[PDB]
């Protein structure tokens, strides 16, 4: 039995003595503060476990228990959300009439006149309209009562307590040994077969037994009062057979193999439910059941204790070709001996997955009455896009950290990492060329269109009525997806999404989802997206590859991961560390995602979202002005920013006034960040010297000498405030533009 | 050399000490020393499955057809009867369920204790009223007859379940 | 092991806690302070003994002069929170509980205070001759009995009027 449980009992004593010795973790900070810089360092190195102990076992035990703490925090957050839904929300009124009632689960105390923020959402209720789509999620779960929300919150609180206790227990009482952590095969088997496999299976069971019948009754018009409790759907089979007359057969078809008998509630119709405007619940049930089967199957791939299984070490060592020397030899050691490598991969994947979620959820609204809630759709899309970008850049940063710290050339001789480091110059040069090519061509299309439109030469622009750049490949793919039902997906009644083509799904006179046509403006904006993504990849990849050494600093690794510079020599050596590459990559990621969000918002407002008449006529929010106005920079400035910013600037005196205040505050913080971004530390140090003289002249002099922020901290603060200001500005802009509806 | 099946050898782990042992272990599951089962779990599970199966057989017989305690009407085979009894007197059936649950929790603690030390034998709860443990022969005979007639209980209950579940 | 003879001999038990009989299947005491557990058990028992006495008292008897006391035990909590008597009893019990929280912390620190020691013997029913241990066994046992009995009474009265 190679895979076995190993723990140390009473690893760490539990006491408050350390709580009164801040900075105990690090050897340098444990000596007490001489200057204010110490303070900052104590908050910067708090979670840098690798720099606090030289033993991997101790770092692993800290990471495990910190993850337990994060789970406790997340469970507390879920408990709070559910409790505010049960006690402070109009969930029942929204249930009764989802179309008219505006979701809201937050109430403001009237203390300074802020009660104006209590909007007239409806349902004899006043509160702040929420855009987290929690009401749609709860309806998809067939909640239909506030007692269930209350008990959901209580369970979440108990789970948060359990997570906290588990963290404490697994640090101070039973801390697993290092050999326990270094089980990639067993961990993958357990996370795939159970965490993701049985999780899907259990959720599919819930949907089949709870969500499906309740939502079917709700769609039929049954008032939530008359819907029997979910447990009533588990005791009397006939009560469910009325809705899906396949339970009558029971589980015998499942074991007999006649799964076709379950097609009543396990369908593959796809498309969207015309009533609620969301995905069919039966489709999601079949989806989760299939995913559960696949995950359970995939969880048996790796060898843990019985001979059968895959050894990932051999798997990696086996893949090597003529062009790559030793192939994937040494990657298993890297990913089982350094948390930074694993964190880089996991953060990159989580970020990309979050962006994929954002793209898929809007195209195929998964919850009932979420499609027509334009405010929820936009908020969810932008939120998950931002999360994905942040996670991607974090993965880059931790890859760089691994390269600086946990990279060992002795164990990486002529493998993939060695070869990549050995043709990094070619990689970066070509990425630079492609970035310049993309930027030039894509952005110069916009500049050319703007110049021609300013000169009155409209026939010379890159527009539909002018030189045309049709995204022919995307249109061809859309056509194929349109034709898929019946030909390449014969058992699928309807296309996966109505974006590609088909009817106009509208719920309550609102266009839930309709086909999206791609024109020259779509071509140009997509190439802008590609340009920005390529530039961000350039910055971050350059930071990762040149993290250890460069033709400027052959010994950069000795300087550490984040350092300000290496002096004004060799010309200038500012921002030469990989941390500074992350610092710039964050700006470029923010820029790219801002463009992505603007594209999504304008395209959806001008081409998808709108209203329908009984005849079938379509009237979009902005009247389809995207095709002929999204092709010039002035068009974006006028028809998108200036035109759609009316709601924020005019929100004063209404329930949305908070959005205008936050708009101004975000502008203020964004401008404030420039103070740190542009200026340097010496000026501020001298100014502080003068101020310290002034204090001393009155015998006021802190023992902790004041110090200007370190160069690295100056950059970090500037970047943090820049991102906060930009994100908040767009947050207020979108929410006020999409809540005045 | 197994007495039950001469063509496949008897397991090393099975020495015949446990009752009802005829060396009938083809797959050699008694040899498990992983995931915490180790043939003491299997023995306990056998005794428990068999006891509850004997109770199940006696219950389904329903010869008196007075619903066990008075006030319980009507006679039905399995599922409708269970639901109907739960419907008419949820208080009593819940009480029985919780009695079983309490004995189950205490039993699980006891299983862990028996794993750690041999003080608790498999299938042993010290519930013997006769309190007969001085001489082995009678104890062994009673235990092995329990296991045999409970195995028959389980097979009979399968004979019950099979009816009405097929196509 | 006492009572349950097949359980694993409760650890850190006996030699204290007059009410103990050796029944610790889960054995929380092993990994938590026994003093804290004793305090919790004693306080739950006292509060619930008073709760049983109140519930039986409210049972069509001893109602206070105010008209609001025509209301029954089940509706008593609602009528009291509306009347505000419940908030006041909360106030006073909270004061007592904070003053006792100081004592609980001291007991845990090693102050030497016994679990339920509140020095409350106006009629000193206890005496060296009476035997404090004999007096406590009854206290703890009748407290556990009251805990379980009140749980049952409230539940099965929420089902149907016990009397
Ligand atoms: C209440 C019980 C208790 C006590 C007395 C201690 C005491 C101790 N722990 Mg333990 N620990 C506990 C609970 C406890 N811990 C729990 C529940 C967990 C699971 C998360 C851990 C996980 C843990 C780890 C992984 C480590 C310690 C360490 C330590 C030592 C230093 C901790 C310190 O001074 O930081 C005090 C810090 C704080 C008070 C800040 C905590 C911030 C919380 C968690 C988040 C709340 C803010 C959040 C962001 C919301 C606002 C927004 C000290 C012996 C360290 C040690 O001994 O190594 C040398 C160590 O590495 N503990
Ligand atoms: C986790 C997410 C979350 C969030 C963001 C909120 C946010 C909010 N809640 Mg909700 N709530 C949550 C979870 C959450 N709650 C949970 C889990 C519960 C169940 C218990 C509730 C139950 C609840 C109720 C019942 C009510 C709210 C209310 C409120 C609002 C006012 C809170 C406030 O300032 O009161 C004042 C809070 C304070 C002044 C905080 C106390 C200050 C402490 C003492 C500072 C101590 C810091 C300390 C020094 C740090 C070091 C640690 C030290 C202990 C050692 C606000 C919108 C109220 C509301 O909306 O009114 C209409 C309201 O009535 N919440
Ligand atoms: C973890 C998920 C989960 C859970 C806990 C349950 C639990 C249950 N199901 Mg469901 N079921 C599930 C997933 C799940 N199912 C899935 C994925 C499908 C699709 C194939 C079904 C399809 C299904 C049908 C068609 C029926 C049930 C029924 C039942 C009940 C009887 C169980 C039984 O006799 O099986 C015996 C136990 C084992 C084989 C073990 C029970 C409450 C029956 C019911 O509602 O009667 C009360 C019934 O007719 N289930
Ligand atoms: C076969 C049953 C089944 C059904 C009915 C659905 C139904 C759905 N899926 Mg799911 N899905 C399935 C299986 C299924 N899925 C599997 C097996 C995968 C793994 C790749 C996915 C991955 C997936 C993603 C990533 C997303 C969906 C989404 C959706 C929804 C989009 C609307 C639609 O018409 O979907 C039609 C669905 C399809 C056309 C996908 C079919 C995928 C096929 C079956 C792949 C099969 C792979 C094959 C088994 C590989 C085996 C290799 C192995 C042997 C080594 C819908 C509820 C979307 C959603 O809910 O967003 C809100 C979404 O973003 N599905
Ligand atoms: C799984 C997620 C994850 C984990 C576990 C870590 C863990 C770590 N990171 Mg990584 N990182 C992540 C995600 C993650 N990071 C992401 C997404 C990014 C991209 C931004 C980075 C970028 C990054 C860099 C560039 C660096 C690290 C560093 C570190 C280490 C020290 C962190 C520390 O001391 O915190 C200290 C935490 C703080 C000081 C709190 C500051 C939080 C921000 C600035 C403010 C948040 C504002 C709030 C959300 C909104 C405010 C509202 C306003 C109105 C008030 C530690 C190993 C550092 C290191 O050297 O490690 C070796 C380092 O240099 N990380
Ligand atoms: C809006 C202002 C602006 C502009 C135009 C640029 C432009 C550029 N940046 Mg910079 N950048 C900016 C703001 C800007 N950045 C800010 C605010 C930051 C702070 C975070 C950065 C940080 C930054 C980094 C860290 C990196 C860049 C990179 C790049 C290049 C991307 C490749 C490209 O598009 O080449 C094509 C050039 C353009 C599209 C510029 C417009 C040229 C037009 C189309 C034609 C002009 C007319 C023509 C020349 C007429 C000639 C005759 C005339 C002289 C009379 C490019 C030089 C990357 C780089 O250099 O590597 C590739 C890089 O790594 N930038
Ligand atoms: C980079 C973006 C971009 C693009 C694609 C264009 C494209 C165009 N512009 Mg515009 N323009 C731009 C930016 C751009 N412009 C900017 C930034 C400005 C502001 C300064 C203007 C201002 C402007 C004006 C004022 C006018 C134009 C005009 C034109 C047209 C004729 C230009 C010409 O004579 O071609 C010259 C082309 C060449 C010399 C060929 C060189 C390029 C070749 C194709 C590269 C091939 C490389 C090859 C693939 C390598 C293969 C290697 C292999 C052998 C191994 C053409 C449609 C004119 C017009 O009216 O259009 C109708 C006009 O009057 N432009
Ligand atoms: C000393 C405690 C005590 C006592 C004397 C009783 C006594 C009784 N209970 Mg109560 N009960 C108790 C604790 C207790 N229970 C506890 C701890 C619970 C769990 C909270 C319950 C939950 C309970 C329910 C749910 C019901 C009873 C019922 C009954 C009666 C059934 C008697 C019979 O022969 O059957 C009986 C008067 C039943 C009754 O008749 O009412 C009934 O329906 N009891
Ligand atoms: C997915 C990526 C698709 C494009 C991959 C290009 C062929 C890539 C390919 O076939 O590589 C295969 C080539 C062969 O390696 P081996 O087969 O010897 O390696 C065995 C592996 O198992 C690794 O050990 O690897 C390299 O030479 C890497 C450096 C590539 C130098 C060419 C890079 C060109 C990049 C730009 C191309 C962009 C095209 C459009 C992208 C959408
Ligand atoms: C303004 C500025 C300073 C001076 C700024 C200092 C010393 C920060 C002062 C912080 C005060 C004392 C804390 C209180 C601030 C707010 C009232 C609230 C707290 C905000 C967070 C710390 C939580 C630098 O030291 C510096 C260094 C390098 C590049 C740019 C700059 C730079 O721009
Ligand atoms: S300006 Fe600042 S970052 Fe640049 S070399 Fe001088 S000290 Fe270093």
Q: What is the per-residue DSSP string for A46-92? A: TT-GGGT-S-HHHHHHHHHHHHHHHHHHHHHHHHHHHHHHHHH--HH
Q: Kindly state the tokens that stand for A407.
A: 């990279």
Distance CA A166, CA A68 (A): 7
Q: List the one residue out of B161, B163, B165 whose CA is nearest residue B153.
A: B161
Distance CA A609, CA A512 (A): 7
Residue from the list B34, B83, B165 with its beta carbon closest to the beta carbon of A252: B165
Here the contacts of A355-361 (C-beta below 8 Å, separation 24 or greater) are A355/A384, A355/A385, A355/A388, A355/A389, A357/A384, A358/A382, A358/A383, A358/A384, A358/A385, A358/A388
Size of interface A-B (CB pairs under 8 A): 9
Helices (H) and strands (E) in chain B, counts: 4, 0
Chain C residues inside the 8 Å CB shell of B112: 8
User: What residues does A612 pair with on adjacent strands?
Assistant: A618
Distance CA A409, CA B58 (A): 74
**Is the CB of residue B119 less than 8 Å from the CB of residue C13?**
no
Q: Which technique? A: cryo-EM
User: What residues does A574 pair with on adjacent strands?
Assistant: A565
Q: Kindly state the tokens that stand for A209.
A: 């037994």
Q: List the one residue out of A243, A239, A226, A232 whose CA is nearest residue A145.
A: A226
Helix (H) or strand (E) holding A507: strand A505-507
Mark which residues 39-78 of B lie under 8 Å from A by CB: none
Residue appearing with tokens 């009754």: A217
Ligand 5 mutation pick, A398, A662, A673, max ligand atoms within 8 A of CB: A398
| Residue B64 DSSP SS3 | coil
Q: Kindly state the tokens that stand for A537.
A: 């990849």
Calculate the CA dihedral of residues A12, A17, A21, A23 and round it to 10 degrees.
10
Q: Is the CB of A251 under 6 A from ligand 3?
A: yes
Is the Cα torsion angle C79, C83, C88, C90 positive or negative in sign? positive
Which whole-number Å values give the CA distances from A654 to A116, A378, A538, A651, in the listed order?
Answer: 7, 21, 45, 6
**Is the CB of residue B119 less than 8 Å from the CB of residue B37?**
no
Distance CA B84, CA B74 (A): 9
Q: Which residue's CA is minimally distant from atom 24 of ligand 2?
A: A84
Helix (H) or strand (E) holding A389: helix A374-405
Q: Backbone phi, then psi, for A574, in 5-degree steps?
A: -75, 145
Calculate the CA dihedral of residues A54, A58, A60, A65 and round it to 10 degrees.
-140
**Is the CB of residue C95 less than 8 Å from the CB of residue C101?**
no
- Cβ-based neighbours of A322, under 8 Å, separated by 6 or more: none
Closest ligand 9 atom to the C-alpha of A323? Answer: 18
A570: buried, middle or exposed (CB in 10 Å: 19+, 13-18, 0-12)?
Answer: exposed
Q: Is the CB of A540 under 6 A from ligand 6?
A: no
Q: Which ligand is nearest to the CA of A239?
A: 3
**Is the CB of residue A85 less than 8 Å from the CB of residue A163?**
no
Please tell me the distance in Å from B116's CA to the nearest CA on chain C.
9
Mode of pairing for the β-strands spanning A174-176 and A610-612: unpaired
Closest ligand 2 atom to the C-alpha of A79? Answer: 17
Q: Kindly state the tokens that stand for A601.
A: 């918002």
Distance CA C126, CA C136 (A): 9
Distance CA C138, CA C134 (A): 7
Q: Please check whether residue C8 touches B, CB under 8 A.
A: yes
Distance CA A486, CA A237 (A): 34
Residue appearing with tokens 């200057």: A35
Distance CA A145, CA A149 (A): 7
Which whole-number Å values give the CA distances from A195 to A190, A198, A211, B86, in the listed order?
Answer: 7, 6, 21, 35
**Is the CB of residue B50 less than 8 Å from the CB of residue B150?**
yes
Closest ligand 11 atom to the C-alpha of A567? Answer: 5
Nearest CA in chain B to C7: B110
Q: List the one residue out of A540, A632, A527, A640 whose CA is nearest residue A588.
A: A540
Nearest CA in chain B to A3: B34
Q: Is the CB of A293 under 6 A from ligand 4?
A: no
**Is the CB of residue A578 less than 8 Å from the CB of residue A561?**
yes
Q: Is the CB of A447 under 6 A from ligand 7?
A: yes
Query: Please, what's the largest Cα pairwise distance for chain B?
Result: 56
Distance CA A239, CA C158 (A): 28
Q: List the one residue out of C54, C89, C92 whose CA is nearest residue C74.
A: C54
Distance CA C139, CA C125 (A): 12
| Residue A119 DSSP SS3 | strand
Q: Is the CB of A284 under 6 A from ligand 4?
A: yes
Helix (H) or strand (E) holding A303: none
- Cβ-based neighbours of C73, under 8 Å, separated by 6 or more: C54, C55, C58, C59, C157
Distance CA B40, CA B27 (A): 17
Mode of pairing for the β-strands spanning A128-129 and A174-176: unpaired
Q: Is the CB of A200 under 6 A from ligand 3?
A: no
Calculate the CA dihedral of residues C61, C62, C68, C74 and round it to 10 degrees.
-50
Distance CA A446, CA A528 (A): 10
- Chain B adjacent subunits, 3+ CB pairs under 8 A: A, C
Is the Cα torsion angle A232, A233, A234, A235 positive or negative in sign? positive
Distance (Å) from CA A80 to ligand 2 centroid: 9
Chain A residues inside the 8 Å CB shell of B83: 235-236
Q: Which ligand is nearest to the CA of A706?
A: 10
Contact C7 B126 (CB under 8 A): no
CA A692 to chain centre: 45
**Is the CB of residue B120 less than 8 Å from the CB of residue C6?**
yes
Distance CA A562, CA A59 (A): 20
Distance CA A400, CA A540 (A): 9
- Cβ-based neighbours of C98, under 8 Å, separated by 6 or more: none
Q: Kindly state the tokens that stand for A445.
A: 């299309």
Helix axes B90-116, B40-61, angle to 10 degrees: 160
User: What residues does A302 pair with on adjacent strands?
Assistant: A310
Q: State in Å, rounded, how far the first CA of chain A is from the last one.
A: 63
* A329: number of Cβ within 10 Å: 21
Nearest CA in chain A to B87: A235
* A362: number of Cβ within 10 Å: 21
- Cβ-based neighbours of B56, under 8 Å, separated by 6 or more: B153, B157
Calculate the CA dihedral of residues A235, A236, A240, A242 and round it to 10 degrees.
-170
Chain breaks of chain C after residues with C–N above 2.5 Å: none
Helices (H) and strands (E) in chain A, counts: 29, 8
Mutate to test the interface with B, among C4, C6, C157, C160 (most CBs of B within 10 A): C6
| Residue A506 DSSP SS3 | strand
Distance CA A91, CA A101 (A): 9
Mode of pairing for the β-strands spanning A510-513 and A128-129: unpaired
**Is the CB of residue B10 less than 8 Å from the CB of residue B31?**
no
Ligand 8 mutation pick, C56, C152, C159, C163, max ligand atoms within 8 A of CB: C152
Distance CA A20, CA A221 (A): 61
Q: Please check whether residue C26 touches B, CB under 8 A.
A: yes
Closest ligand 3 atom to the C-alpha of A198? Answer: 1
- Cβ-based neighbours of A578, under 8 Å, separated by 6 or more: A397, A400, A401, A403, A404, A543, A544, A546, A547, A561, A562
Distance CA B125, CA B142 (A): 15
Q: Please check whether residue B167 touches A, CB under 8 A.
A: yes
**Is the CB of residue B111 less than 8 Å from the CB of residue B44?**
yes
Which whole-number Å values give the CA distances from A532 to A7, A389, A592, A596, B15, in the listed order?
Answer: 48, 12, 5, 10, 73
Is the Cα torsion angle A284, A377, A144, A86 positive or negative in sign? positive
Residue from the list B105, B116, B120 with its beta carbon closest to the beta carbon of C25: B105
Ligand 2 mutation pick, A16, A82, A84, max ligand atoms within 8 A of CB: A84
Distance CA B159, CA B153 (A): 10
Calculate the CA dihedral of residues B110, B116, B118, B120 and round it to 10 degrees.
0
Distance CA B144, CA A680 (A): 88
Closest ligand 1 atom to the C-alpha of A172? Answer: 10
Instruction: List ligand 10's pocket residues with C-beta within 6 A.
Output: A 675-676, 679-681, 684, 708-709, 711, 714
A665: buried, middle or exposed (CB in 10 Å: 19+, 13-18, 0-12)?
Answer: middle
**Is the CB of residue A266 less than 8 Å from the CB of residue A284?**
no
**Is the CB of residue A45 less than 8 Å from the CB of residue A27?**
no
Residue A624 φ/ψ region, left for φ over 0, alpha for ψ in the -120 to 50 degree band, beta for the rest: left
User: What residues does A127 pair with on adjacent strands?
Assistant: A119
Please tell me the distance in Å from A434's CA to the nearest CA on chain B.
55
**Is the CB of residue A336 less than 8 Å from the CB of residue A34?**
no
Distance CA A257, CA C51 (A): 58
Resolution stated for this PDB structure, in Å: 2.8
- Cβ-based neighbours of A510, under 8 Å, separated by 6 or more: A99, A372, A374, A609, A610, A611, A612
Which whole-number Å values give the CA distances from A39 to A35, A630, C16, in the listed order?
Answer: 8, 49, 49
Distance CA B89, CA B68 (A): 13
Q: Kindly state the tokens that stand for B142.
A: 């009673």
- Under DSSP, the state recorded for A129 is E
Residue A594 φ/ψ region, left for φ over 0, alpha for ψ in the -120 to 50 degree band, beta for the rest: alpha
Q: List the one residue out of A540, A551, A341, A548 whose CA is nearest residue A425.
A: A551
Calculate the CA dihedral of residues A563, A567, A573, A578 and round it to 10 degrees.
-10
- Chain C adjacent subunits, 3+ CB pairs under 8 A: B
Residue A507 φ/ψ region, left for φ over 0, alpha for ψ in the -120 to 50 degree band, beta for the rest: beta
Residue A351 sits at the vertex; the CA angle it makes with A347 and A357, to the nearest 5 degrees, is 140
Q: Kindly state the tokens that stand for A382.
A: 């932008």
Mode of pairing for the β-strands spanning A505-507 and A510-513: antiparallel
Q: Determine what percent of chain B falls in helix, strand and coil, rounding each to the nearest 5.
A: 55, 0, 45
Distance CA A431, CA A420 (A): 14
Q: List the one residue out of A576, A588, A594, A598 whose CA is nearest residue A537.
A: A588
- Cβ-based neighbours of A216, under 8 Å, separated by 6 or more: A243, A281
- Under DSSP, the state recorded for B63 is S
């Amino acid at each position: 039995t190679k895979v076995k449980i190993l723990v140390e009992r009473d690893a760490t004593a539990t006491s408050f003595e350390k709580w009164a010795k801040p900075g105990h973790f690090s050897r340098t900070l444990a000596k007490g503060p001489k200057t204010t810089t110490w303070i900052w360092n104590l908050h910067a190195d708090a979670h840098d476990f690798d720099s606090q102990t030289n033993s991997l076992e101790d770092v692993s035990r800290k990471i495990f228990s910190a993850h337990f703490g994060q789970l406790a925090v997340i469970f507390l957050w879920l408990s709070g959300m559910h409790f505010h839904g049960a006690y402070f929300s109009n969930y029942l009124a929204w249930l009764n009439n989802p179309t008219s009632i505006k979701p809201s689960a937050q109430v403001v105390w009237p203390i300074v006149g802020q009660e104006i923020l209590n909007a007239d959402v409806g349902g004899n209720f006043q509160g702040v309209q929420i855009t987290s789509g929690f009401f749609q999620l709860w309806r998809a779960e067939g909640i239909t009562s506030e007692i269930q929300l209350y008990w959901t919150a209580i369970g979440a609180l108990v789970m948060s307590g359990l997570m906290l206790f588990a963290g404490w227990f697994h640090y101070h009482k039973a801390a697993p040994k290092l050999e326990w952590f270094q089980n990639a095969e067993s961990m993958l088997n357990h996370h795939l077969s159970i965490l993701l496999g049985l999780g899907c299976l259990s959720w599919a069971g819930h949907q089949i037994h709870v969500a499906l019948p309740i939502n079917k009754l709700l769609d039929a018009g049954v008032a939530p009062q008359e819907i029997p409790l979910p447990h009533e759907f588990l005791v009397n089979r006939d009560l469910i057979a009325q809705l899906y007359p396949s339970f009558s057969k029971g589980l015998v078809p499942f074991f007999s193999g006649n799964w076709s008998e379950y097609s009543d509630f396990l369908t593959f119709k796809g498309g969207v439910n015309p009533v609620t405007g969301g995905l069919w619940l039966t489709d999601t049930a079949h989806h989760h059941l299939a995913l559960a089967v696949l995950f359970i199957f995939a969880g048996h791939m790796y060898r843990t204790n019985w001979g059968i299984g895959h050894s990932m070490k051999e798997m990696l060592e086996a893949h090597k070709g003529p062009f790559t020397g030793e192939g994937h030899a040494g990657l298993y050691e890297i990913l089982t001996t350094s948390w930074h490598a694993q964190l880089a991969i996991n953060l990159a994947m989580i970020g990309s997955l979050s962006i994929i979620v954002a793209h898929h959820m809007y195209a195929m609204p998964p919850y009932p009455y979420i499609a027509t809630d334009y405010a929820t759709q936009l908020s969810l899309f932008t939120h998950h896009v931002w999360i994905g970008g942040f996670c991607i850049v974090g993965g880059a940063a931790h890859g760089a950290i691994f390269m600086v710290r946990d990279y060992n050339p002795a164990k990486n001789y002529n493998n993939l990492l060695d070869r990549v480091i050995r043709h990094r110059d070619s990689i970066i040069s070509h990425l630079n060329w492609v970035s310049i090519f993309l930027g030039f061509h894509s952005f110069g299309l916009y500049i050319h269109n703007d110049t021609m439109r300013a000169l009155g030469r409209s026939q010379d622009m890159f527009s539909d009525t002018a030189i045309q750049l049709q995204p022919i490949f995307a249109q061809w793919i859309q056509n194929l997806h349109l034709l898929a039902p019946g030909n390449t997906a014969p058992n699928a009644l309807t296309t996966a999404s109505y974006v590609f083509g088909g009817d106009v799904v509208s719920v309550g006179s609102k266009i839930a989802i309709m086909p999206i046509k791609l024109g020259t403006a779509d071509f140009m904006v997509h190439h802008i997206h590609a340009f920005t993504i390529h530039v961000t990849a350039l910055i971050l990849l350059k930071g990762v590859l040149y993290a250890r050494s460069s033709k400027l600093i052959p010994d950069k690794a000795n300087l550490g991961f984040r350092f300000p510079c290496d002096g004004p020599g060799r010309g200038g050596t500012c921002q030469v560390s990989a941390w500074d590459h992350v610092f710039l990559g964050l700006f470029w990621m923010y820029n790219s995602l801002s463009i992505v969000l603007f594209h999504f918002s304008w395209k959806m407002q001008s081409d998808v979202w709108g209203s329908v008449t009984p005849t079938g006529a379509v009237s979009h929010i902005t009247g389809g002005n995207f095709a002929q106005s999204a092709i010039t920079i002035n068009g974006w400035l006028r028809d998108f920013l200036w035109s759609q910013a009316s709601q924020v600037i005019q929100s004063y005196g209404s329930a949305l006034s908070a959005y205008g205040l936050i708009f101004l505050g975000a502008h203020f913080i964004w401008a404030f960040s420039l103070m740190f971004l542009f200026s340097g530390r010496g000026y501020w140090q001298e100014l502080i010297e003068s101020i310290v003289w002034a204090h001393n002249k009155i015998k006021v002099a802190p023992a902790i000498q004041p110090r200007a922020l370190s160069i690295t901290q100056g950059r970090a603060v500037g970047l943090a405030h820049y991102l906060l200001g930009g994100i908040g500005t767009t947050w207020a802009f979108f929410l006020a533009r999409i809540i005045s509806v | 050399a197994s007495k039950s099946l001469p063509f496949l050898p008897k397991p090393e782990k099975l020495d015949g000490s446990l009752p009802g042992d005829v060396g009938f272990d083809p797959l050699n599951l008694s040899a498990t020393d992983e995931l915490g089962l180790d043939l003491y779990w299997f023995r306990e599970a056998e005794v428990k499955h068999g006891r509850i199966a004997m109770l199940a057989v006696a219950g389904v017989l329903f010869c008196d057809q007075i619903g066990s305690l008075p006030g319980f009407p009507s006679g039905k085979d399995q599922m409708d009867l269970f639901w109907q009894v739960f419907a008419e007197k949820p208080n009593v059936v819940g009480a029985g369920v919780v009695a079983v649950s309490i004995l189950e929790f205490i039993s699980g603690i006891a299983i862990t204790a028996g794993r750690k030390d041999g003080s608790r034998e498999a299938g042993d709860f010290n519930l013997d009223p006769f309190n007969v443990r001085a001489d082995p022969a009678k104890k062994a005979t009673a235990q092995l007859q329990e296991i045999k007639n409970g195995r028959l209980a389980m097979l009979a209950s399968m004979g019950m379940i099979a009816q009405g579940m097929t196509t | 092991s006492a009572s349950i003879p097949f359980m694993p001999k409760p650890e850190k038990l006996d030699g204290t806690v007059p009410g103990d009989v050796g029944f610790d299947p889960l054995g929380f005491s092993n990994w938590v302070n026994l003093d804290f557990l004793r305090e919790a058990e004693i306080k739950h028992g006292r509060i619930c003994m008073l709760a049983v006495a109140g519930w039986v008292a409210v049972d069509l008897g001893l109602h206070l002069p105010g008209d609001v006391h025509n209301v029954g035990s089940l509706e008593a909590h609602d009528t009291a929170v509306k009347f505000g008597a419940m908030s006041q009893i909360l106030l006073w019990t909270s004061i007592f509980e904070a003053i006792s929280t100081v004592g609980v912390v001291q007991m845990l620190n090693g102050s030497g205070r016994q679990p339920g020691y509140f020095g409350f013997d106006p009629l000193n029913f206890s005496k060296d001759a009476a035997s404090k241990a004999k007096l406590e066994l009854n206290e703890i046992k009748n407290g556990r009995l009251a805990m379980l009995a009140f749980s049952g009474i409230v539940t099965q009265a929420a089902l149907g009027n016990d009397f």
